[PDB]
Design a binder for these strands. Structure first.
Ligand code: CA
Ligand code: CA
Ligand code: CA
Ligand code: CA
Ligand code: ZN
Ligand code: ZN
Lengths: 351, 615, 615, 352
DNA sequence: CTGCAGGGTTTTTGTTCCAGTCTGTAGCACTGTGTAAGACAGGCCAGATC
DNA sequence: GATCTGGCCTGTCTTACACAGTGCTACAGACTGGAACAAAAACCCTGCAG
């Protein structure tokens, strides 16, 4: 439970407030480069390596069997477990593009071949969606479940721009939470269907999720309409009663209020968390350790590593997960003048 | 003896009448026989012509103004014009106003509050309108004034910051402001062209030119980067009702000069970051796309009349053009903006080209890229899709630049001279310092002949004093072979022949002889290049070469001018913006640009420049 | 046939002369035969009669005021007044002018070059004069203007270089210009005192106040010094038992609008060399001027003038630096007594004025020669703190502004010490000092709403010494006794602040002056009782000044609020604003522009054209 | 040969002014002349000099009780009085220009009296009066001592001055004109003063360097402002002290040298090597100049100049003095915004 | 009667030159400011290599 | 199967350079006369046109 500063050697002007990170087969991949890709890197996926406390970067590429991906800003990340038929992958949907339009198109990203000389190959199969498709929305969340015994996928959360009947060009950059109806995603066929329950009184954003054995638990978030930062930690239970995707849900009492989380698991189902903010002026500073089992989630607060003062009095901040109790955070670095490197990095780890 | 003679202007009017009764009755009977007894006008003209005898024009002009009516007060309009036209800030006005006011007994200027009251007739938001059909996803108001640009970002911390600062109008209300201003000029076009009034209510078409440029690091002692997005009325023609392929009514006569480039949006952002730029410019794009379909109704001269539109998006430098269009930046393999050639397929064939580049097909290419329906390889995909990378967003007619239009051509002629000092086809492997030696001897040659001290980089003036048959002969003095001399003479002769064609304003009116003869001349040019100078352009070419040999005639046939769309004009208005900020600061950033835009848009209307007679 | 002859008021002046030739020559012969050959007055009287016979009397009366009375718009003088009194540039002025005339004929304002000719009337070098007796070692010239400030420094790089940029006036010419400016008011004063004019031309008396302190950071070298003076008062002495009659007394001397600049230099106030090396000529002027009698033709009569000087307005730092005393806060502090540091603590109030400028000279000679063969610090005692050579006779006084700001910062740190329980804990911590800083910072941020700066201005002080703000501050320190104590201190301070802020305390508050001694005495006994913990033997300079010396100063002088230095540091803001929007700009010329503008900015012959025609 | 080393002063960047002087008293080296009147840190203005490990340090000096204090002159004259009967060892100073730009015209006999204790020095002064027929106030001259079988005196020549007091004008109050070519034979005890003219002294001048030996003196290059030229000639006077009229004769040399505001270095009894000042009004000299002299004559030949740094060969000006015995100190006006505030880098030059 | 070609008529308006006279504007000297063309370094990739 | 360097590529200082703002000045173009004159506007007035 400690921190250590890093050094943005170069390639620093290519990391923006929001982004994503994916752990798979060792190498961790940055996603969401500011601005459209350059000829420096066509894809946008960067490989990151770190040695002696340096933050260096390398470009990646795809096969021909692959589609090319827009650099989405705040998507939803979901880990596909490695088993039949085509393991293993990571799923993205759908965020906002460098043009403020929105995807409504999930992608199925994988690794293909290596090295030979430590090099990596990936592919990106967009999975067309039949339904009842989800409408484009961001900040939301997705998760994977394996329910007796077929595997499928579940979506929740999200804001958007108002439907294009009161889409008002003075407010043309407003947001309002989409009506909170979960969607169910089968891989193939992509039989996307909407559902809901009365317990889903209202829908939130920026809420990290967590699932295991088709019983998912939702964490702290925020809702604009009521301006609250509710504590409504939720459980929901699903199962494939083919031919019926039966669902059940229930509120639970204890729920923390932490926005823009930073999730780095360590154990089989044990997650040490940072959390971006406590209240929309005052950020969160303390850590969090979360157990969970078939009895349920159980909370605990580990030790907070000693943030330097420079982060303590920041106006904002964010971060991402480097894996295995270790992760990467960032500061909007106020310098007079700008370096223009607006982001120092401190590294965090467990024990 | 008698009474001594006294001066006539000291005696009372009785003695003046006594001594001048003779001339009084003489002028009386003279006026009776000559002008019908108009004694006052005749004695006025005589007093005047006697005043001009001693070259004393001034008091005679003053009294002439005291006659034929009076102009005691000043029209409030001209007065607001005089506050703005000189950057006088508010309190400065009020001070000079109090001064002159209680100086001499008459309200020569108008005071503040009435100035501002009369002014509110000139900003956006003062002339109601319908819209046929009603607009697609557009607000309904018509008095909405200066909207903040942020466009309702919930100030929430979570997401991308909302710290960006911006102020603008709604495009439509800006257009209606400019037009309702220009009522005088459109009615002048009507009186000149001898066209009916009850039969001129529908067939209008206004061409409106967009433009956006970065503006760096506003210098103030005490908030640096800036972007300014503006438009300009270009022409308005008739379309009723027969064939009438086109009958212009009001053609702008100083197209680029910043006196006509009405600012519409301003944002303390950087030219670079695609993100926040789009995040604001969206609404503008939505309006633009949404507007071009419908038609517009407006009362002018009591008769509500119709207006259509077409848009010519031109005013950008190449970086911005790649950005909005989605192509790489910049020294890419897809060097052009209208063809698809690499360097090489422009090297083998230079001018035998065709313009095809278009917006919706760029959208198409982008979709193709994203899906990759042919699952080909990376560089395979790039080449098969013609270098499109990113979903573009704003239609821009990607026209050639007029401002530089030479500087590549300049430096190219410069290098060519430096190489014809050398012998490249005998020593095709020059070294580091020999090229410098040759450059220096060339420059000293020119310095001795044409008084052009050496340089590091090519401004305009340098090039213009360069491209002279005179400087051609002077540099020819240095190249040894009697043969290649006349060759490059033919070269620069053709280039001189073609320059004005593209820096023109209306060659269809200015000098059409070269325009009609152009294409063949460009052909002879490319022939001379490939035949006598292939040593250098085997596979690589300069950017501007593609344009200048490619489509100039095709572009003019597409439009009919080049300079009449160059944003070079907007590059002036930066001087305005910066000074305005220096002299009408509020100053908090929230209202800073508020007043900046208010005063600026005031500065840029016809209505007031018409009161800038100086006649 | 024949073309119809139109009304006479529409024809061209060539056609008008051709139409009137008959009556033109008839009026010529009539003027030549009967009026002495002057056609102009003849046609003037004729137009007068043709108007007055029509009962259109307003137009004829306005015409008759325009002739022989300067109409012609408003004025050249008022015009220049406007052009300067709101900083309008030359291009700005001409642009306003050609517009305001272009539309709306009957020009009001005047062009530039007429203001070029007008300015020659208000600068130095125009009104003739001489001295009785003639002046020693001062030039015989009188028509010179702005002089290059070096006094003609030999450029030979061997000596000290001419590294300085400076321009100035000829001090005497500046004086005579300001005096001939005050002619209007001195004539009205001779009126109001019911005094003769042709007589009493011998006992005029002028007093002159002069000050100098620059500012920092003039850039984007960097520093500057500004030496300016202002006519204070002017009285008449004739002829005997009559002690004197104050003719004019300046009604607002403390403010900007009377501070005539006389020299400006890009020097630091620190490097004592370049300072004197420039200011020398002014020293010679002052010295040689104290005696001779000045003679100007004011009010038609050339009348005698005398001069007494009173050098006052230097902030204390320079007052030392021009009195050569130890710099600056050593054991010798009182610029007016021989007192030590501690001998101002044992006794704070009972001191006599001892400092005599010429005795500073004669004791500096004792320092040098040392007639009693004394060691170093024994001699420092025997001379009583005299180290360097006195150079400029400064009248033994103090300023208002810096004294009161020193009181403000003293009470500021008295708060920052009483928030700590330091009377029990004798040695506080530096970080606890900074935290007491922060707690008093939020304290005065909560009430009275003022911000933190590292260095202080005037409003900070004037709103910083008030009783309800003290109670807003007393609400932190826990005691019930010390709060009432230093609130009694604030109250007693308000018993005395306008005593030195008084313009004439024998008017504004004689009750607070005649009891001044007892107020300072209660002050001293309180410092000895409850705040002795801080002032055992260490005292601040301004405190001694305000406590022990005020009464004898005012008793001998007439005021303190009179000779204060308010204008200088406050109008260096106007200096800055000048160099901004009126410079040339180029080093050797920045001044020769700024000075012309500044001295222009401050002549009554203009300031009246702002107030006199305001009410 | 000769060599330079770039130095840096630790805690001194505002005492050294464009003009100053250097003095050696009994192997001990003293700077002279500060910018600005005496601060409380030192009421004297004289400073101990030290050069160690590339660092330049300074210290304060003190005086006696019978020792009158000295105003900080800027460009006076200097001449070592030879330690002899009765009172060694004087070091005369007069009279420079004052901070308030006047001219003192006062002879100050300066010497050492006692020491130490711990490297400590105690000085004194006697501002001597001048009986005459005294020289007027002026500056930039130089003077030296002579001995005539065996009477010993000290004589001055040269200098500029302000305009005459009658014709002085407030717009010319800072221009200066050269002094009349009259030499002043200065007795020291008693403090008698007598002026002498020289018919072959075609004009006055300034800024010359000179040295004396065995009653005969040679005057080196300075400047004359009449033509704005710099004569490269040299002059020589053969003078003795005869009772009671010290009869004196002078004559011209064929060729001297063109130097202005130089740096005088000793090595031996009368063998000197000079570091050069300025050639013309904007072009300064760069090379050394060795000068041998005797009763046969002055024998002169150049030396090898060291390799200057980029700045000093590209700066606008420079100045300095000799630490004695072939050791010296120089200075460059620096350029910087922000000011370091070290406006002066420091070099030290020596011989062999 | 109409129709135009063009004759008369007086009356605009330019028209020529030399001596003044006023004024509106372009040219000049000038350093602070934005700049983008280019020197470059320094990192990366393929080629020759370990 | 892993390492090292030239070619080159792309973001980065940096530095010549235009150019804008301001007083000042200089010059050039509009303003004064007597005669004597084309050339045209538009009333009129004839004269060849049916
Ligand atoms: Ca740009
Ligand atoms: Ca630009
Ligand atoms: Ca001060
Ligand atoms: Ca100050
Ligand atoms: Zn093309
Ligand atoms: Zn005192």
């Amino acid at each position: 439970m400690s921190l250590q500063p890093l050094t943005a050697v170069n390639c620093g002007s290519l990391v923006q407030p929001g982004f994503s990170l994916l752990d798979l087969e060792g190498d961790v991949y940055l996603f969401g480069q500011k601005g459209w890709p350059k000829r420096s890197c066509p894809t946008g996926i960067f490989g990151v390596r770190i040695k002696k406390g340096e933050l260096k970067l390398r470009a990646i590429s795809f096969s021909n069997n692959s589609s090319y991906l827009p650099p989405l800003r705040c998507p939803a990340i979901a880990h596909f477990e490695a088993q039949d038929g085509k393991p293993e992958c990571y799923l993205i949907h759908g965020g906002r593009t460098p043009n403020n339009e929105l995807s409504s198109s999930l992608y199925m990203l994988s690794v293909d071949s290596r090295g030979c000389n430590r090099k990596v190959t990936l592919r990106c199969e967009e999975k067309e969606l039949v339904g009842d498709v989800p409408s484009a929305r961001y900040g939301h969340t997705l998760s994977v479940i394996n329910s007796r015994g077929k595997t499928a996928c579940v979506l929740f959360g999200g804001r958007s721009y108002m439907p294009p009947t009161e889409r008002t060009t003075q407010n043309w950059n407003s947001v309002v939470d989409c009506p909170p109806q979960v969607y169910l995603i089968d891989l193939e066929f992509g039989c996307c269907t909407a559902h809901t329950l009365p317990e889903l009184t209202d829908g939130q954003s920026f809420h990290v999720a967590l699932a295991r054995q088709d019983c998912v638990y939702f964490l702290g978030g925020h809702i604009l309409s009521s301006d609250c930062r509710p504590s409504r930690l939720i459980r929901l239970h699903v199962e494939l009663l083919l031919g019926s995707p039966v669902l059940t849900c229930t509120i639970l009492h204890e729920g923390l209020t932490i926005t823009s989380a930073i999730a780095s698991p360590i154990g089989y189902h044990e997650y040490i968390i940072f959390g971006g903010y406590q209240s929309e002026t005052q950020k969160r500073m303390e850590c969090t350790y979360v157990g969970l089992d078939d009895v349920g989630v159980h909370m605990e607060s580990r030790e907070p590593p000693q943030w330097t003062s420079e982060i303590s009095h920041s106006r904002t901040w964010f971060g991402g997960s480097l894996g295995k109790g270790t992760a990467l955070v960032a500061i909007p670095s106020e310098g007079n003048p700008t370096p223009p490197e607006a982001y120092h990095f401190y590294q965090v780890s467990f024990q | 003896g008698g009474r001594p003679r006294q001066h006539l202007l000291s005696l009372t009017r009785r003695a003046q009448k006594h001594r001048l009764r003779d001339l009084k009755n003489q002028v009386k009977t003279f006026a009776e026989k000559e002008e019908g007894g108009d004694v006052k006008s005749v004695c006025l003209t005589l007093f005047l012509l006697a005043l001009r005898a001693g070259n004393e024009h001034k008091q005679a002009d003053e009294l002439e103004a005291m006659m034929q009516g009076r102009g005691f007060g000043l029209h409030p309009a001209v007065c607001l014009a005089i506050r703005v036209n000189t950057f006088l800030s508010c309190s400065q006005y009020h001070k000079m106003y109090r001064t002159v006011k209680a100086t001499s007994g008459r309200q020569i200027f108008q005071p503040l509050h009435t100035l501002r009251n009369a002014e509110k007739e000139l900003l956006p938001g003062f002339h109601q309108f319908e819209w046929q059909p009603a607009l697609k996803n557009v607000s309904t108001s018509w008095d909405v004034g200066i909207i903040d640009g942020l466009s309702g970002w919930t100030v929430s911390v979570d997401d991308v910051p909302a710290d960006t600062i911006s102020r603008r109008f709604r495009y439509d209300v800006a257009l209606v402001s400019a037009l309702k201003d220009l009522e005088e000029d459109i009615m002048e076009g009507l009186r000149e062209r001898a066209l009916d009034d009850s039969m001129c209510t529908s067939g209008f078409t206004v061409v409106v030119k967009e433009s956006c440029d970065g503006m760096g690091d506003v210098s103030e002692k005490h908030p640096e980067k800036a972007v300014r997005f503006s438009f300009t009325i270009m022409s308005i023609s008739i379309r009723l009702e027969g064939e009438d392929d086109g009958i212009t009514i009001f053609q702008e006569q100083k197209p680029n000069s910043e006196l006509s480039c009405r600012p519409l949006c301003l944002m303390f952002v950087d030219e670079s970051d695609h993100e926040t730029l789009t995040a604001i410019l969206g609404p503008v794009v939505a309006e633009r796309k949404a507007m071009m379909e419908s038609r517009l109704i407006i009362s002018v001269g009591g008769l509500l009349r119709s207006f259509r539109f077409f848009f010519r998006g031109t005013g950008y430098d190449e970086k911005m053009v790649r950005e909005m269009e989605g192509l790489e930046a910049s020294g890419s393999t897809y060097i052009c903006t209208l063809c698809d050639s690499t360097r090489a397929e422009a090297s083998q064939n230079m001018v035998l080209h065709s313009i095809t580049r278009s917006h919706d097909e760029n959208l198409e290419r982008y979709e193709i890229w994203r899906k990759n329906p042919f699952s080909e390889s990376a560089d395979e995909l790039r080449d098969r899709v013609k270098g499109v990378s990113a979903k573009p967003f704003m239609e821009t007619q990607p026209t050639l630049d007029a401002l530089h239009c030479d500087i590549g051509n300049a430096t190219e002629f410069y290098k060519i001279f430096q190489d014809e000092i050398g012998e490249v086809y005998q020593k095709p492997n020059p070294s580091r310092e020999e090229r410098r030696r040759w450059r220096s001897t060339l420059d000293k040659q020119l310095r001795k002949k044409m008084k052009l001290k050496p340089v590091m980089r090519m401004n305009g003036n340098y090039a213009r004093r360069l491209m002279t048959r005179e400087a051609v002969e002077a540099v020819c003095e240095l190249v040894p072979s009697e043969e290649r001399r006349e060759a490059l003479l033919k070269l620069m002769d053709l280039y001189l022949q073609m320059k004005p064609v593209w820096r023109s304003t209306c060659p269809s009116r200015d000098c059409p002889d070269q325009l009609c003869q152009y294409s063949y001349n460009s052909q002879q040019f490319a022939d001379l290049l490939s035949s006598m100078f292939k040593y250098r352009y085997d596979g690589k070419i300069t950017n501007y070469l593609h344009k200048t040999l490619a489509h100039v005639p095709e572009i003019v046939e597409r439009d009919g001018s080049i300079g009449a769309w160059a944003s070079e004009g907007n590059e002036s208005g930066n001087k305005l913006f910066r000074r305005f900020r220096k002299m009408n600061a509020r100053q908090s950033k929230t209202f800073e640009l508020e007043d900046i835009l208010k005063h600026h848009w005031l500065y840029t209307s016809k209505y007031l420049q018409k009161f800038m007679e100086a006649h």
